[PDB]
Structure 1
Amino acid sequence: ASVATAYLTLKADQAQLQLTKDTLGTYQKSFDLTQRSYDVGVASALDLRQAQT
């Protein structure tokens, strides 16, 4: 029972890491768009910091 539930936790956390990498990709592309909007002049630096955090 213990080795079955240990393999099930590892199997779930592989997919947890796979989803967290995709969330990091979405946040990183949102920061890239806010950096482009800051570099031209539309967005202020406050939205740039709020996208960086």
Structure 2
Amino acid sequence: ASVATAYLTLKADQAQLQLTKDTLGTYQKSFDLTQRSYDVGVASALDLRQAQT
């Protein structure tokens, strides 16, 4: 039982790690777009700061 549950937790953690990698890629794209909007002059610095957080 312990070996089975440990292998299942490993597989579940690997899948959740892939999904958090996708979340990090999405947040990187969104932060780059807000950085472009702030560098152009349309968005203020506060909208950049919240995307940074």
Alignment of 1:3-22 (within 5 A): 3-22=3-22
Structure 1 unaligned blocks of 5 or more: none
Percent identity over the alignment is: 100
| C-alpha separation in 2, matches of 1:5 and 1:18 | 20
Structure 2 unaligned blocks of 5 or more: none
| C-alpha separation in 2, matches of 1:43 and 1:18 | 32
Structure 1 vs Structure 2 CA RMSD: 0.3
TM-score (norm 2): 0.98
Runs of 4+ in 1 over 6 A off after TM superposition: none
